[PDB]
Amino acid sequence: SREEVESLIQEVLEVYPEKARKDRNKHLAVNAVTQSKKCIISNKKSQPGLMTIRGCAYAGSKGVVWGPIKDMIHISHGPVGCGQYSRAGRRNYYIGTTGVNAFVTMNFTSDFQEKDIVFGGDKKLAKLIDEVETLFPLNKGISVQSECPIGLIGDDIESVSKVKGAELSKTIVPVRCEGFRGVSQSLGHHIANDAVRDWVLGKRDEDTTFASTPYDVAIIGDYNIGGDAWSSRILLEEMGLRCVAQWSGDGSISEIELTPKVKLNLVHCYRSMNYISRHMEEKYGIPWMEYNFFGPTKTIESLRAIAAKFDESIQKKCEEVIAKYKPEWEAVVAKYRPRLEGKRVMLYIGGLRPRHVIGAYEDLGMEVVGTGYEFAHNDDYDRTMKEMGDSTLLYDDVTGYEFEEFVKRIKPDLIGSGIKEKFIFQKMGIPFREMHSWDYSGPYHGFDGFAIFARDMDMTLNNPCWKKLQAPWE
């Protein structure tokens, strides 16, 4: 630890040319670290040719934020690649009749050909909007998720959206999330939050119809991966709150449009949703707080903090919820912590989970020896410092070579990352769990999710397959 990590960091960097070596030195840190500014830099350009795990601003808008909105149709405006590669790849679960009143797992696209590059796609988009309205009459809004060429060729999707929106009396949201904008999916979050603000959030500011209650609340930044938000709202409503809306996991446009009515915004994913949360505080006065539903420790801390923002009845029901699920998650730790205690885990995820799931691992007696983000910011890393232990390894926008080399020396018993990393480390004999798609399992949020998370970590870490990597004859 300490000098042992610092020397691992320089040792692996000696393979790079100096410009890449100098840059990547700034993105590798070991944990007076109250201030990220001061030990690691983040949210910068990726080095060319180093195999970044990052995505694009389209993935940050269409993939994560806009796609999950279930009663709207989201148009991948541009060539066929982006809509197809992201078709149903993120498990933003929802209730709906797909193709009729819900459209999350479908792929709508303008399928740019060269003719559209030459002459522009603005006329094709207007014709496409009409075809959507004839064939999918029960959609309650349309978004246009711009892919790379749209801005480069000089289209004006805002004019199409404004012209067509009036002709059809329909919500049409232009989103300028072209993949070359930004350094990652992060700017796609920001671009998508502003598109929500400008074209959707203000439609019911003067509409004071909705009957409000003092306990109205909204879940901000839960995309219902495997049902994560469903396993979270049940706890809030058992506590006596009314979840008016979830953004964007199983979210409807009406739900979003009613969010200005709530008393408190509950922010799970700070990174992707802090922008709109601050804006609703400025314009509508609604306060917002961050919370954590990963593992029993963090969930209880969050339920009691949320309840403290209301009256004694809500705080009372909070303790009733806590007492109800206490024996359930105690049985889970009693079963699984003996099988996972003392095991060390390395993580690498997007912009929240790398810090958000640490408490859950520790609830099973595991030690997070290394975490990192693809596209986090210094305020994400400030928050990471408190959660990580002394002498742990920190890495921002890690290279595949860096991540391999780090695993080789640290030798964790489990790795938590994405699909592009999974089969590398499985071949190295290290148990791997996907911390994006939950490995097609989940939910992992709340008390119901902790049981699945613990079962999933156990089944993989202790699997008999891991003792068979070496042929008995070598």
Partner: protein, 522 residues
Amino acid sequence: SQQVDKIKASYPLFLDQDYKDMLAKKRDGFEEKYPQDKIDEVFQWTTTKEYQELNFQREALTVNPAKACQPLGAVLCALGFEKTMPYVHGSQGCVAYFRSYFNRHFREPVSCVSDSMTEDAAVFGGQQNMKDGLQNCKATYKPDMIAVSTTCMAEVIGDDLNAFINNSKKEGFIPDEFPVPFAHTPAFVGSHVTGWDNMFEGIARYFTLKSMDDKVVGSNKKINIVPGFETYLGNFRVIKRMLSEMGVGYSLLSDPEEVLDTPADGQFRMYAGGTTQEEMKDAPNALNTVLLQPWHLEKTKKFVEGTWKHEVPKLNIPMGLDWTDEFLMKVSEISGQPIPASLTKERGRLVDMMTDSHTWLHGKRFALWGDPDFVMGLVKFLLELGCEPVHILCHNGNKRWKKAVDAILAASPYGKNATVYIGKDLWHLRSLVFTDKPDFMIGNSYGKFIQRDTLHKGKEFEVPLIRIGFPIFDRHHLHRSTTLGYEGAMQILTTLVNSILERLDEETRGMQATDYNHDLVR
């Protein structure tokens, strides 16, 4: 709630009473959702002939495409060469998508890099991204070759790949002799199969064009084999197996079988096997070059004939009985090797399986989709089996291709009720299996949502999916299968007849209702 000894995942946890009521209150309180009977009315409308006519009037909107973009195929083509790193000049988001797309179909690592071209490349080009990109990749991942393609951003702004690589060598970012083949692969032209063609031609260009003077056709007495966009490991392996059985000297140009199937023995291998740079340099000395999927290898074809002076045979994809026969007969003629007893027997074994299973296959109607060569080979085999390929959809096919397939359907009484669709997508196909219901679908994993839709109308109307094609994401290790040659025809036959019989068993499992036909022996 959870029972510790029986944890419920999302299914069936959310069917619990408390979750059901919560979801009901979320919908009634804040979703402003259309009434259920209006949803049913619209769903039933979407299954009608009326709707289909409107569906087929689409000019701008594409829904549920059955194709990807060019650079995807360029990546797959590059992974088939020895210690080669695929390198896509453009934006990084594409590469994460390409790798994840292939990660989930092959359940394997996929190595591919980008040079992270940003908003600033829009104004001054991506030349600094090329110089630093090549140098970093070459130094970090120690490739023997870097195969360069493009994202659509790089294409629109006009980056000169040739000049950028040449200047990267001039100013010393990479060695001058370091192999860097390139190919422009605009995502707004053709599809993923076109990117495979463009990349392979670029690589053949690189190692041969400037060296043709020393080349004599046939001097290495080999046959060149170009597989094209291919995502079944067994298809690479069955071609190499049959030629080795025939004693035919061959060179498989682009062969990713090793890197897409490395063993889990405690270490991660970034590279494994693949076509060597020499096999490319020496390819002009081959007797001939056989294109396994010619309908997406035209650019390659022109280069092999124009520059290598090879007389590429007119061969269909080796799928089914007749076309494997023709493939083997043409190889025998070019190489002078006779077809061995082992392959003649294997053929008779496939015919034997056709005779044993024809009573269950006869007349069975299928809706199918995929890439052009895969589709027409599936059509041809289905006709040899007495089945009717009623709905033949190829989203990335062209007019000449459709004409060749239409001619095939006309020469057999089992193509009588068949129609070939090009430029249509899986939303079009959904309509066809409702208005003109077949018995099964043969397609990739996206077809699962069509069976979902059909079952919702009624069990009588459900069209079960048979997973053959790309990508297959919801089953494990089907990428190990074979679809070419006699062996692949044997696997397809077995899959088809057993899908038919599994559905028959399901429909005759109801005790006292339908199990009079629940025969032990079928």
